[PDB]
Amino acid sequence: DGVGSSSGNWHCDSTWLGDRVITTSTRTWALPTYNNHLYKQISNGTSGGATNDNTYFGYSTPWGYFDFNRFHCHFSPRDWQRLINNNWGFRPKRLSFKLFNIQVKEVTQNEGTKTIANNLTSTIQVFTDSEYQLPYVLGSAHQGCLPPFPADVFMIPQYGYLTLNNGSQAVGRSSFYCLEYFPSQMLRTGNNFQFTYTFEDVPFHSSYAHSQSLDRLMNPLIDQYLYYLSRTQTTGGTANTQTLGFSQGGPNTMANQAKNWLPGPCYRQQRVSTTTGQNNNSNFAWTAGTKYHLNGRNSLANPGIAMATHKDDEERFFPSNGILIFGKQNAARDNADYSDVMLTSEEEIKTTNPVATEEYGIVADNLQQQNTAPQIGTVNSQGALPGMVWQNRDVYLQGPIWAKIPHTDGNFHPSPLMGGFGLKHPPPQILIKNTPVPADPPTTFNQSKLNSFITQYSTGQVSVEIEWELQKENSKRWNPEIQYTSNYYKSTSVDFAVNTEGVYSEPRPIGTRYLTRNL
Amino acid sequence: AHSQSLDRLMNPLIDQYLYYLSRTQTTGGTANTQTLGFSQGGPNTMANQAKNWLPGPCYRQQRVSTTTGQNNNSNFAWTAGTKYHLNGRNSLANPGIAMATHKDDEERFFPSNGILIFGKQNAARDNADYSDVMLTSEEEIKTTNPVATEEYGIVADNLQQQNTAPQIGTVNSQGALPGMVWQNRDVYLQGPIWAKIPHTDGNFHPSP
């Protein structure tokens, strides 16, 4: 554990062992001093432009955090291809995390000339929130996760949290946390940190698409023995009067046939087209957005429960806030063009799940009578009904992996809505900070806290290893499956590769569901 | 079959210690103004009593009578049928979730596509007469499950105010709510025994 001796090696690999795959990656990082060494109160209120829906109360902290909750932190594009093309399912089993080769540097600025030097005796502090005592800020799809491309050097994100608020104000229940009230390791150059974690049992992700649909599980050639009411009135001529007629479900009457199951739940969303001409001329993104109402505050249900993006033959349509959208490289933060972003599609689940932009179904609204014609209602939100079966949202190479399930008395089907695996005891937050080094103090005692510090940053490498369990395919299907493939024909550059300018980009979103399964 | 019903699980002889809002306005004369009055649930107030549980889920269906004269004169079997919508295709929810076929004293009524019907021997395939088929009844479950042809219940539609009278909504489809208890559909000698549960990520109560 010396100044001149390395404390880690570079591990970035994948190994496939038939029923498992193990992924390792190492990246280089830089950490600044954040917040000037201070915790600060932050709020947003209703004054000025601001609106109720957007209020908060919280704190920002001197700490930074390590995030690897994006699939491409771990899987190279080819590796992801191996996985999706060949397996029915996968899930995480365990992980190894390492921090090594720490360098702490002090930067000196005089006279417009800046110089950087090592500070050999400085420390950084690290800890894991093993007991989940801090607010869990992973699982909100933030930036600052390790880069997809290994050669890229990245900056650690700042840590901050939120509590209860009224407008811009705190309430009694509001909580303040100091991270310095936790035990942490202090490392100088030459020291290292590691920890090991085991994933809890969780269901395999479905890397498959159904090749059957709920409404067509019968034998095409045979009638049912079960009747349905087929006629309510006679068909003679002008003489028509009420009658009761009953018929047996059959091949040409598949819609009428008795069935055992129901499609999944529905929370209907407005539909927008990629051909702008077909859209209404208003700015309806929020006004027509699909939302939930919590304590006087309205939130987009984005993306909400999983519903098929579009029905047959309507690729142009998407739910206004019902899909995941990734930026293309260098797409702008605000108001990026359609050509600048990539929209995901959940078309694969039309098979068991309702289309996002359409009704669940129809129910009766009234009681018909001789003098009252029957009336119906369109159902646009449907909660869980017995017999319902459904599929979860897909995961993407540039998508999230896990989320912490909130600690509540109850939940229903706690699969994270953005996609991924939901864990009660997810991987713990890892928090890192540079210890403050004071500049020279006054020569006579002053009680006030020191506000003059040396300027420092640190750099190092980090490693993550994850073991994934695979579910092999067992299909008896005769014909070939759909597969993810690279383009055959010539092109200006290779997809999933660098630029002339050295910039890595991921051209498209890649999902998981290529192989198929019966229902 | 249950010999008790969800709405009558109390002791008939004893009051609750729990109050409910019983009066919103005074009853003096012509002078009436708003007030708040609270009362304790009791034997003659069983409907008002506080309770622990809720009836089962609802997907309401049109009602037809075996006495044809009481039916509307249209052919409404599909147009008024209860359906689900999957990928542009509409299917009858036949027979759908289990709900009681009819309430007290109304044996004549059935859900248009909400029961199982068996043919009598040599009944025709198409357009058989009522006398040629046999209709099942799920009357036994009125005890915990909603009647097929009627609403789940009533919810508020608005916020009442001094100038706004309160308004209500009739609930015709109700998904699962905490506290709900229910019974499954019955089986018959000429009925099916089992079904394969579909291989899906999720399901709710997978009784066929």
Place this chain on the structure above:
Amino acid sequence: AHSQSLDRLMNPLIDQYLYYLSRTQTTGGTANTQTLGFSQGGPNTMANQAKNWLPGPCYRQQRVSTTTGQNNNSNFAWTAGTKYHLNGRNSLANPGIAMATHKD
């Protein structure tokens, strides 16, 4: 009691990497036409941010005030009561599923 709320589980300081549809129409002048605009959720846009969870179930009930003057002048305790219907009989859902009594 929870000291956090479902709608505020994020990091206040960081943007999401996920976009949402933020503009459906242009904002130029009188010339406005349809467009598609997409934005990233952030600190001042917390309502718009993508989220993993949903609030609990709802069976809505009429509201009454302890200040009588603010109530409607009718006796609406049963007529406006929240109920369930079982076999031709109506029962108050009292107290029913758990919902917060009032907001801030």
Place this chain on the structure above:
Amino acid sequence: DGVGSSSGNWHCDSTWLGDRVITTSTRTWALPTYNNHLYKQISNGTSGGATNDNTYFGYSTPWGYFDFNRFHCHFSPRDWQRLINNNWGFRPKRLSFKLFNIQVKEVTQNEGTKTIANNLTSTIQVFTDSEYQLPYVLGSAHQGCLPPFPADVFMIPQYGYLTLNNGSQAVGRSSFYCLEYFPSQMLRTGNNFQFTYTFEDVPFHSSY
């Protein structure tokens, strides 16, 4: 015990064990050179404004001292809440003190441009007055105790003492102490110091 290796870790916690509670805290500190490396005689007398009630004779020293004699050095506000709300009494039993991760720095000033660098070979000296042979200046409610808030960085207080005086003058009985006449540990970066202490029996405080 190396330049590149840390000698301590950050411990700031509380654990409650039903009949005991253990508190740990760590803070970051800075120490200046005090007095220019010199002991100096100080007095206050009656000349000018000064009054008899306020006279003293004493010395100031190059040393600094560590003070944690304030409850909030050890208890977070919530922890204090746990204690006061639930217990009739409390008292201290034992303590552990550690000093680690020493950095000594040399500051160079030229021409209005100042630069700070490590001095790897420099030492600091520490000792405990185990035998109570020096004037005990703790217990007078001074400033310079560890901060209540863990993130705060603090400056070590200077050590000075008083003896007998007549006006601004010493008397025969007056005593002079040199701290360099005690044995002390010398630590370079990479060295650490610790000691352990046991409290004598004392009555429980009445938190009631």
Place this chain on the structure above:
Amino acid sequence: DGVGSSSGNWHCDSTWLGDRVITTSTRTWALPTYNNHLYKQISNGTSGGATNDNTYFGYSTPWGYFDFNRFHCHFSPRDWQRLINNNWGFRPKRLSFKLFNIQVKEVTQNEGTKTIANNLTSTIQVFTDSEYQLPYVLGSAHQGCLPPFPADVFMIPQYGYLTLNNGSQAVGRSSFYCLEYFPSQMLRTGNNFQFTYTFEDVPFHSSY
């Protein structure tokens, strides 16, 4: 494995054992940062002067490589004379490779005055493509092999590779490689690297 301790010694010798000869050489090297830390796409096409015969698509990388594939890397002229004058044939049997005495330096430029200093805590990374998973760029007679003369100090060559192209364009089959997706050793000053290799059977060269 320390800052002040050497990790290697200088071996440059030849020993003749009648049926074998063993050659050892040591050279001093310098490695720059290449490509600004970036992989970059490179192509050559048919526009301008360029012709079809000369088109390519490829990448350039931040890495450098070690090349000793020239006989005079290993044989002094007199040694080569001993070999050619007296033997009918020769071939390689095995090799040992070592990297030692690493120094990483940081260069600071201000105001037209440049200064160079050690960075004690910096690393370099090394690896061998044992499984032949990268494009093999040795064997194309490039420059950058160790110098014939031992006293000469040399600069390490940059690593780049080629794939399939159409004109200046990639094709589907075109492959991109990142060297950071391999495991590599990280060494600070004071660390060293070595590996051993055995040649496969191959025919003797005909020195006749």
